[PDB]
Amino acid sequence: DLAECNIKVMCRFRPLNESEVNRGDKYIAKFQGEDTVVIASKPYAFDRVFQSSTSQEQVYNDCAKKIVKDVLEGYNGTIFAYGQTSSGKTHTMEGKLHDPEGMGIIPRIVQDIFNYIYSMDENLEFHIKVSYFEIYLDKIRDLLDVSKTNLSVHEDKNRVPYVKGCTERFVCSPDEVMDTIDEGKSNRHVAVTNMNEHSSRSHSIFLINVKQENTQTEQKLSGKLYLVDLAGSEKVSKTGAEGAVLDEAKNINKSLSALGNVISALAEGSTYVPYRDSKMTRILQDSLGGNCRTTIVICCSPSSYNESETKSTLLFGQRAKTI
Numbered sequence: 001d002l003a004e005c006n007i008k009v010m011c012r013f014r015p016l017n018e019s020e021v022n023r024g025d026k027y028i029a030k031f032q033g034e035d036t037v038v039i040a041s042k043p044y045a046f047d048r049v050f051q052s053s054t055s056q057e058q059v060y061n062d063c064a065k066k067i068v069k070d071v072l073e074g075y076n077g078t079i080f081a082y083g084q085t086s087s088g089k090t091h092t093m094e095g096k097l098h099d100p101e102g103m104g105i106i107p108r109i110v111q112d113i114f115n116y117i118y119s120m121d122e123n124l125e126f127h128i129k130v131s132y133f134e135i136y137l138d139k140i141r142d143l144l145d146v147s148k149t150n151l152s153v154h155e156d157k158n159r160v161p162y163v164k165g166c167t168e169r170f171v172c173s174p175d176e177v178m179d180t181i182d183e184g185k186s187n188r189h190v191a192v193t194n195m196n197e198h199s200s201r202s203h204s205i206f207l208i209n210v211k212q213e214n215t216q217t218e219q220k221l222s223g224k225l226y227l228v229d230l231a232g233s234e235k236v237s238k239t240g241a242e243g244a245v246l247d248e249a250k251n252i253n254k255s256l257s258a259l260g261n262v263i264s265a266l267a268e269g270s271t272y273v274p275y276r277d278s279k280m281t282r283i284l285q286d287s288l289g290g291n292c293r294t295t296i297v298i299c300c301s302p303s304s305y306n307e308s309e310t311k312s313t314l315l316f317g318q319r320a321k322t323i
């Protein structure tokens with residue numbers, strides 16, 4: 001209702017890696033202005049385009065800073081990291097959790113929430129609760145409690161969605177939150193044979209609920225910020241058991257396609273948005289579109305080898321036609 005589709009898209013290119021250089025790949029991305037990248041002669045503009053040496057600090061200031069303010073202002077928000085595997089999603093969303101320079105968006109957000117709280121501490125009473133869960137094969141598992149598997153989405157008395165039985169943990173300091181993230185990351189290995197395969201094919205969702213009440217004013221505020229590290233958008237090249245010399249069978253991830261439809265619908269100014277297309281979009285319903293701010297950071301390898309995948313990513317990001 002604020003502006004309808006408050007979706008910003010930033011494209012982040014990472015440096016060519018040693019494997020790409022070793023392979024003999026070339027840097028195909030050309031840049032123009034602070035918002036356009038050129039691939040195969042075709043220009044793609046976005047809210048911003050980050051070249052290969054952009055800092056975690058620049059990404060946070062341009063992509064998340066304002067959203068954090070909105071959450072403290074009492075609004076909901078969502079920030080996504082989209083792209084093929086090895087593009088830079090995790091580096092962007094979390095990076096080095098404890099390195100002041102190398103930390104990603106999540107650490108910097110936590111840092112800013114508490115710092116803000118510390119500068120308040122007068123008449124405002126805060127309460128921060130976090131949740132950490134993953135979506136694999138359109139099934140939800142609690143990363144804070146590995147017994148909570150295949151959870152279901154439900155809507156409460158006031159339409160607000162929630163994951164039935166998902167752990168909600170009250171945190172009181174940045175360190176408590178990082179410990180929570182660290183626990184979730186360790187818990188994730190449970191019942192997973194191949195973590196590489198699993199991580200690239202699943203979605204991590206970290207929720208930060210910031211509630212506050214001014215003891216004097218009495219006006220209460222509550223904001224939810226969902227931080228999402230999506231599954232790899234590259235469906236192609238699925239190796240394994242199937243038609244040996246005859247295969248090309250694999251779809252686009254259910255949640256990614258559901259997200260695509262939701263973003264396109266919002267971009268079109270449609271009154272009906274297809275949130276029900278997936279558990280992910282259903283849970284995110286009260287924080288995606290509407291009167292919520294949303295930043296999607298599409299990450300890309302500048303490699304000649306990943307040219308076609310990059311095109312796809314760029315195209316996905318374009319679903320949110322801005323003006």
Ligand SMILES: Nc1ncnc2c1ncn2[C@@H]1O[C@H](COP(=O)(O)OP(=O)(O)O)[C@@H](O)[C@H]1O
Pocket residue numbers: 013014015017052083084085086087088089090091092200299
């Ligand atoms: N912006 C970057 N600067 C330096 N190294 C990067 C950059 N982005 C990604 N990498 C590195 O490339 C590797 C794969 O990136 P990662 O974020 O794990 O990929 P994914 O998109 O699969 O989550 C990691 O070591 C990561 O730190």
Ligand SMILES: [Mg+2]
Pocket residue numbers: 089090199200
């Ligand atoms: Mg990853």
